[PDB]
């Protein structure tokens, strides 16, 4: 029955991390027709308004959204990565990448300038392998990343497959 | 394990109709954090541009959207339902309801004038009950439908449960 196949999907979903859930949600959106996408667009808007109207999330959401699209902030995190706190900085990059807005070239470039350094550091095992794969997962399906950017990045994906 | 959990979910989904897919996707969005909602917002804005850029689905998508929000199209359809073609008109309404834009009061009014007539018709077995149950399902979680609207529609929902 439906409430039983829905409960199965909800259970496996809550067994997924935020990257995993977002990637699958992107896959499922591909199995939908226009009316459904439009309905979900309006629904995400309501959820976003609610999230920004409560202290449990409002400040946390505004700052991450701005930081993720702020070339000055990102350049400083890159500058800080080369030296240390690489792992922590990559977690921050993984949490901000989903918010990168299509058309923000200034910020996209900084992002695409760190992934190579992150890939090289996983091959020396300076940083965890799963984190860079999670970041790469987003880059492959990201609405802000062009096919041209993905070509320049394939030279780094093989090392992760 | 992950690719497998995803293949399970994906299969249960493709075994679902559009209304079940849209309602489940709505519930899963409530289990996402802000960065994920933004990614999916930008992602749909690509999949939507995708549909409106390919003959396969561009025209049909543009038309059902205008029709679902055009009081002149909707009024003319209500005037034709009363008489006949109820099942086909009800199917058209179900296909169009998800595209009702929040703030479109003129269009919303006509949708809410037809729902009573259709619940009465399902009780006299003039129309299939499944269709009306799917219409009320969208109405219960619809961003364009207010709490007031819901309370005014509660008398007709009891009969459907």
């Amino acid at each position: 029955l439906f409430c039983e196949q829905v409960t199965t999907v909800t259970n496996l979903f809550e067994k997924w991390n935020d990257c995993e859930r977002t990637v699958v949600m992107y896959a499922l959106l591909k199995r939908l027709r226009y009316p459904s996408l439009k309905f979900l667009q309006y629904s995400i808007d309501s959820n976003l308004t609610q999230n920004l109207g409560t202290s449990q999330t409002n400040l946390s959401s505004v700052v991450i959204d701005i930081n993720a699209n702020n070339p000055v902030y990102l350049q400083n995190l890159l500058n800080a990565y080369k030296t240390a706190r690489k792992e922590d900085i990559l977690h921050e990059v993984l949490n901000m990448l989903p918010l990168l807005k299509p058309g923000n070239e200034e910020a996209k470039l900084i992002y695409l300038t760190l992934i190579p350094v992150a890939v090289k550091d996983t091959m020396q095992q300076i940083v965890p392998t799963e984190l860079v794969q999670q970041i790469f997962s987003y880059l492959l399906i990201h609405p802000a990343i062009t096919s041209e950017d993905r070509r320049s990045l394939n030279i780094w994906l093989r090392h992760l497959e | 394990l992950f690719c497998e959990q995803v293949t399970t979910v994906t299969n249960l989904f493709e075994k679902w109709n559009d209304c079940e897919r849209t309602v489940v996707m709505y519930a899963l969005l409530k289990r996402l954090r802000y960065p994920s909602l933004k990614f999916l917002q930008y992602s749909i804005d690509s999949n939507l541009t995708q549909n409106l850029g390919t003959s396969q689905t561009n025209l049909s998508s543009v038309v059902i959207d205008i029709n679902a929000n055009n009081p002149v199209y909707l009024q003319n359809l209500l005037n034709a339902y009363k008489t006949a073609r109820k099942e086909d008109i009800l199917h058209e309404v179900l296909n169009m309801l998800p595209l009702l834009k929040p703030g479109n009061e003129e269009a919303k009014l006509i949708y809410l004038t037809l729902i009573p007539v259709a619940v009465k018709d399902t009780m006299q077995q003039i129309v299939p009950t499944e269709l009306v149950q799917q219409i009320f399902s969208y109405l219960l979680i619809h961003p364009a439908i207010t709490s007031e609207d819901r309370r005014s529609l509660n008398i007709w929902l009891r009969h459907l449960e």
Binding site: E20, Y26, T129 | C3
Partner: peptide
Amino acid sequence: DELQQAMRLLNAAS
């Protein structure tokens, strides 16, 4: 497909 490529990386990372 790039989405398939992404699920493989996400597979490995679990």
